[PDB]
Amino acid sequence: TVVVTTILESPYVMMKKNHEMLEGNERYEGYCVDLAAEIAKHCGFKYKLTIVGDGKYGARDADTKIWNGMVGELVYGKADIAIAPLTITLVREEVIDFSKPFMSLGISIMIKKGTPIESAEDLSKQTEIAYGTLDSGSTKEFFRRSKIAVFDKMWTYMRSAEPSVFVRTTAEGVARVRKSKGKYAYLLESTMNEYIEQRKPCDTMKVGGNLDSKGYGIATPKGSSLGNAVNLAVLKLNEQGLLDKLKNKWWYDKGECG
Ligand SMILES: Cc1cccc(Cn2nnc(-c3o[nH]c(=O)c3C[C@H](N)C(=O)O)n2)c1
């Protein structure tokens, strides 16, 4: 029985309305719940969905060099596979294996609609509008490592800003954009940015294009007997249009903007 780690982010994984009446994997619904079921059915294994204990995607602690988040759950044996919007990055590939991507994304900028910011460079050259990103995720790592002048300027500001411009959850980032009256911009992936832009109260927007181009992948620990079969499953699901089907199922709700 394969232990799956994932993260409670709508629309990937959500508690069903009647979850108290249900058990095990039946408590959950969403894109990654369906994807887990499809991967398991194609590979022929039983599995148990679990929510990442520390709530994080995953970064290497600068002091202890210990990985946290879903990455750490794989590296140190709490889970066998991660099925989540987990970004494929070279630093993470040092310690875990990824499938080919099942969804594309890029780093992007979220603002309150009407805020006078058109680009990363616009953000970088001012301080009235604070801006930041998620702790222990791939976007913070991207900015920390970037040698692009604009992005390094942004990092130099973010890493030393007080009070902190970083958030612990993606929902907190979005809430801070909304609560700040245009005085906070959140650096987050284009998936969440566009998903939120389409939903009530319809007060946020993605500005400029994306800052990079990456993907989400299914992750396994190095040496896992599962890696090969999981990668083949993702490729077949993609080819068969199942990933398109899951996006069409989970991305668009009734009663949203427009
Ligand atoms: C549609 C939808 C709804 C909610 C959440 C998501 C996934 N997601 N969107 N943005 C992020 C994100 O932004 N900066 C980061 O660091 C991460 C995390 C990143 N994916 C990582 O692996 O570290 N993660 C997508």
Going along the chain from its start, the domains and CATH numbers come out as: 1-105+215-254 (3.40.190.10), 106-214 (3.40.190.10)
Ligand 1 within 6 A of CB of 141: no
Q: How many whole angstroms separate alpha carbon 17 and alpha carbon 6?
A: 19
Ligand 1 within 6 A of CB of 138: yes
Nearest to 103 by CA among 93, 88, 89, 92: 88
- Please, are residues 191 and 143 in contact by the beta-carbon 8 Å criterion? no
Which residues neighbour 219 within 8 Å (Cβ) at sequence distance 6 or greater? 70, 71, 74, 81, 82, 86, 92, 96, 97, 98, 99
Query: Radius of gyration over alpha carbons of the chain, in Å?
Result: 18
Which residues neighbour 250 within 8 Å (Cβ) at sequence distance 6 or greater? 11, 12, 30, 31, 34
Ligand 1 within 6 A of CB of 173: no
**143 φ, ψ to 5°?**
-70, -40
DSSP single-letter state for residue 86: P
Please identify which residue in the block is written with the tokens 């301080």. Answer: 127
- Sign of torsion over alpha carbons 180, 129, 170, 188: positive
DSSP secondary structure of 213-258: -EEE--EEETT-TTHHHHHHHHHHHHHTTHHHHHHHHHS--TT---
In the reported structure, the alpha carbon of residue 193 is separated from the centroid of ligand 1 by a whole-number distance in angstroms of 9
Q: Which residue ranges make up the annotated binding site?
A: 85, 87, 92, 138-139, 189
Please identify which residue in the block is written with the tokens 């970037």. Answer: 146
- H-helix or E-strand containing 48? strand 47-51
Please identify which residue in the block is written with the tokens 């692009």. Answer: 148
Q: How many whole angstroms separate alpha carbon 238 and alpha carbon 102?
A: 7
Q: Give the technique used to solve this structure.
A: X-ray
- Helix, strand, or coil (residue 206): strand
- Sign of torsion over alpha carbons 99, 100, 102, 104: positive
What is the stated resolution of the deposited model, in angstroms?
Answer: 1.6
- Please, are residues 170 and 13 in contact by the beta-carbon 8 Å criterion? no
Protein residue whose Cα sits closest to atom 10 of ligand 1? 189
How crowded is residue 136: how many other Cβ atoms within 10 Å of its Cβ?
Answer: 21
Q: 31-43 and 227-239 helices cross at what angle (nearest 10)?
A: 110
Which residues neighbour 237 within 8 Å (Cβ) at sequence distance 6 or greater? 35, 38, 39, 42, 102, 243
**Residue 50 exposure: Cα atoms within 13 Å on the Cβ side:** 19
Q: How many whole angstroms separate alpha carbon 102 and alpha carbon 151?
A: 27
- Sign of torsion over alpha carbons 163, 168, 170, 172: negative
